């Protein structure tokens, strides 16, 4: 997986095998994020989170 995300700096989009949402793994802290938080960069996500704009 090789994408740009305006996620908070602990970014890495993972996703469940059969269940339908992603989960955002932090590599540098043992933690994860579920939906776009206040520390996120929506501008750098609008180019990501939607295909048509």
CA pair distance 49, 52, nearest whole angstrom: 10
**Cβ neighbours of 7 (radius 10 Å):** 22
| Residue range of the domain that includes 24 | 1-53
Chain centroid offset of residue 44 CA: 11
Q: How many CA atoms does the CB half-sphere of 23 hold within 13 Å? A: 9
Experimental method: NMR
The token pair at 47 is: 């180019």
Q: How many domains are contained in the chain?
A: 1
CA pair distance 2, 40, nearest whole angstrom: 19
Q: Tokens 């602990």 sit at which residue?
A: 10
CB burial of 17-53 (b: ≥16 within 10 Å; e: otherwise) equals: eeeeeeebeeeeeeeebeebeeebeeeeeeeeeeeee
The DSSP line for the chain is --------SS--EEE-SSSS-EEEEETTTTEEESS--TTS-HHHHHHHH-S--
Query: 8: domain CATH number?
Result: 2.20.70.10
């Amino acid at each position: 997986s090789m994408v740009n995300t305006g996620l908070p700096a602990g970014w890495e989009v993972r996703h469940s095998n059969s269940k339908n949402l992603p989960y955002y793994f932090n590599p540098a802290t043992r933690e994860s994020r579920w939906e776009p938080p206040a520390d996120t960069d929506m501008e750098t996500l609008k180019m990501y989170m939607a295909t048509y704009h």
